[PDB]
C-alpha cells in the first residue's frame, strides 16, 4: 500500500476543497443518498486521518462504469488518480445536467402548449360567449335548418338530414370526418 506524498502539505490540500465542493454540487443537483453522512465527516473537523479514503468514498458515489474504476485503480501516482477521479465526476455531471436540462425543456414546452390552450379557451369563452357557436358552426346548423325550411320536402331526406346533423354536432369542428360531413350536408 503505497502512500508517497510531498513534505509541504500546505497547498496540496487545496484540491480537497474543490473535490468536496464538486461532491456537494453533485448531491444537490443529483440527490442519490442522504446528506447526513457528508455533515458527519467534515474536512474542517480534522478527523480525516486518511484523505485517500475520503477521496475513494467521494468517487464511490460516481456512476462511472466499473471499467473506469479499474482504470483509476491502475494509476499509482496520487495526483494522477485525483485528476482521474475529478474527470469521472465531471463525466457524471455532464450527463446529469443534460438530463435535467432536457427534462425542464420538455416540461416548458408542455407548459407553453397548455398556456396557449388556455388562451384559446379564453377566446372561446369571452369573444365566443357560450351559445352562439359561430365557430362550432351550430349557427350554420340553424342556417341549414332555415335553408331546408322553405322547401316542400320528402320525409326520407329529412330523416337522413337529421342523422347527418346529429353526426355533425357530435363531431368536433376540425375533424376531417367533420369536414366531409359538412360538405355532404351542404
The footprint of other proteins on residues 47-106 (CB under 8 A) is 53, 56-57, 59-60, 66, 69
The footprint of a copy of itself on residues 39-68 (CB under 8 A) is 63
Nearest to 131 by CA among 141, 122, 139, 123: 139
Which three three-digit cell numbers place residue 53?
479514503
Contact 41, 48 (CB under 8 A): yes
d(CA 43, CA 25): 16
Contact 24, 30 (CB under 8 A): no
Size of the site for other proteins (CB under 8 A): 7
Kindly tell me the sign of the dihedral angle through the C-alpha atoms of 142, 148, 149, 154. negative
Task: Tell the burial category of 31 from Cβ atoms under 10 Å away from its Cβ (0-12, 13-18, 19+).
Answer: exposed
Task: Name the minimum Å distance from CB 31 to other proteins.
Answer: 18
Cβ neighbours, 10 Å, residue 87: 12
176 binds other proteins (CB under 8 A): no
Task: Name the minimum Å distance from CB 88 to a copy of itself.
Answer: 11
127 binds a copy of itself (CB under 8 A): yes
Q: Which does 184 bind (CB under 5 to 8 A by kind): a copy of itself, other proteins, none?
A: none
Task: Name the minimum Å distance from CB 172 to other proteins.
Answer: 45
Residues found near a copy of itself in the complex (CB under 8 A): 11, 14-15, 17-18, 63, 83, 86-87, 90, 94-95, 99, 103, 106-107, 110, 113, 116-123, 125-127, 134-137, 163, 166-167, 169-174, 177
Contacts with other proteins by CB under 8 A lie at 53, 56-57, 59-60, 66, 69
Amino acid at each position: 500500500v503505497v502512500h508517497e506524498d510531498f513534505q509541504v502539505t500546505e497547498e496540496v490540500k487545496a484540491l480537497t476543497a474543490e473535490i468536496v465542493k464538486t461532491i456537494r454540487d453533485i448531491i444537490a443537483l443529483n440527490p442519490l443518498y442522504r446528506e447526513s453522512v457528508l455533515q458527519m465527516m467534515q474536512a474542517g473537523q480534522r478527523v480525516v486521518d486518511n484523505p485517500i479514503y475520503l477521496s475513494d468514498m467521494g468517487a464511490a458515489l460516481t456512476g462511472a462504469e466499473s471499467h473506469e474504476l479499474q482504470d483509476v485503480l491502475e494509476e499509482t501516482n496520487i495526483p494522477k488518480r485525483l485528476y482521474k477521479a475529478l474527470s469521472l465526476l465531471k463525466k457524471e455531471f455532464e450527463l446529469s445536467k443534460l438530463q435535467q436540462r432536457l427534462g425542464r425543456e420538455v416540461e416548458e414546452k408542455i407548459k407553453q402548449t397548455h398556456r396557449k390552450y388556455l388562451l384559446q379557451e379564453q377566446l372561446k369563452i369571452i369573444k365566443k360567449e357560450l351559445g352562439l357557436e359561430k365557430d362550432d358552426k351550430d349557427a350554420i346548423e340553424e342556417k341549414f335548418r332555415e335553408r331546408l325550411k322553405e322547401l316542400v320536402v320528402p320525409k326520407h331526406v329529412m330523416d337522413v338530414v337529421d342523422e347527418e346533423l346529429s353526426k355533425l354536432g357530435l363531431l368536433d369542428n376540425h375533424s376531417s370526418e367533420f369536414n366531409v360531413t359538412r360538405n355532404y350536408l351542404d
